[PDB]
Write a protein that binds this ligand. Structure first.
Ligand SMILES: Nc1ccn([C@@H]2O[C@H](COP(=O)(O)O)[C@@H](O)[C@H]2O)c(=O)n1
Length: 127
């Protein structure tokens, strides 16, 4: 399987979520930002690269957040906790970003794959 990595960036007690702009089926729906691992890259390399490109931030990649998600035949989607090293996130590829708290998680219009992590994200923001 091709691995797609995604980041749960928690800062000052809130989670960053990113509103996709493409393709039509997902445009307007919310995700943890990330992207495909390239051959030879570690998950950490890939996720840090994607978030630098997508958000303009330097992050440190930490523990897994939740379980793998079967995207399709070809792909598996993995989330990791990430934390900010430098920069402020801006939507270079996305329609919008938002900082959300625990009680906003389950009401967001998630992209279908990522919705699996809702309980994990609520827990990560709870307490
Ligand atoms: N949080 C994410 C990030 C990506 N993806 C999927 O991973 C693939 C590659 O991600 P990008 O489209 O963001 O490059 C896409 O097919 C997208 O549907 C996802 O389902 N959830």
């Amino acid at each position: 399987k091709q691995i797609v990595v995604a980041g749960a960036l928690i800062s000052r007690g809130t989670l960053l979520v990113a509103q996709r702009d493409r393709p039509a089926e997902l445009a307007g729906l919310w995700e943890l930002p990330g992207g495909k691992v390239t051959p030879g890259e570690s998950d950490a390399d890939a996720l840090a690269r994607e978030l630098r490109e997508e958000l303009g931030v330097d992050v440190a990649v930490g523990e897994r957040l939740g379980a793998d998600v079967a995207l399709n035949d070809a792909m598996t989607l993995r989330a990791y906790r990430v934390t900010l090293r430098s920069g402020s996130p801006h939507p270079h590829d996305h329609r919008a970003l938002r900082w959300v708290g625990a009680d906003e998680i389950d009401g967001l219009a998630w992209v279908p794959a990522d919705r699996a992590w809702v309980p994990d994200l609520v827990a990560a923001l709870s307490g």
